[PDB]
Symmetry: C2
Subunit: 112 residues, 2 copies
């Protein structure tokens, strides 16, 4: 899979998971989140050659098309596949609010 095991050890040009730890206040200016302080959001990025982790028939055909006609800018894109939720605690004045946000962390990628 296009995951941490395959992708983190050594960076390649093709679509792969890329590490990204986001600090809420440092990176986004969001001071309202009390816990956690940050999380591993990660991101997907990289080229999508013919049949490289193709999502649909459309991805397959377009990866071929892009190889023959790169100028058209029609390549499939490296995007999230598997994601995980993240629970946060924030305060509304003096009210603790717990919220489980879905699809916050990317664990794998694909060419779509």
């Amino acid at each position: 899979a296009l995951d941490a095991a395959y992708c983190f050890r050594n960076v390649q040009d093709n679509c792969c998971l890329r590490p990204l730890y986001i600090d809420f206040k440092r990176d986004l200016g969001w001071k309202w989140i009390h816990e956690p302080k940050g999380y591993n959001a990660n991101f997907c990025a990289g080229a999508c050659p013919y049949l490289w982790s193709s999502d649909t028939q459309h991805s397959r055909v377009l990866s071929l098309y892009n190889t023959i006609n790169p100028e058209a800018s029609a390549s499939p894109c490296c995007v999230s596949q598997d994601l995980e939720p993240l629970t946060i605690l924030y305060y509304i004045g003096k009210t603790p609010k717990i919220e489980q946000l879905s699809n916050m962390i990317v664990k794998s990628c694909k060419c779509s």
Copy 2:
């Protein structure tokens, strides 16, 4: 929606559906498909600003992050949302083979 109605009349920089008619033999060298001769595959392409057709919480956060830190190359990507199948007829020697291929045509996009 990021569809033909919104996107085809006049090209913009943000994520939007882009027209693409693919001729099997002319564009891909595939001479094996008898019918149809080509089809409107289309493709998604364009920038993904904060909250522009955001797919998941991950897309939301990353669109914000990319605005503040464009150099990280972590922007969400403009990809297919709604797709349609395509039926083809090809011959195996003297055998007509009908196959309904799923997700061949893109009708709408999203920032993922």
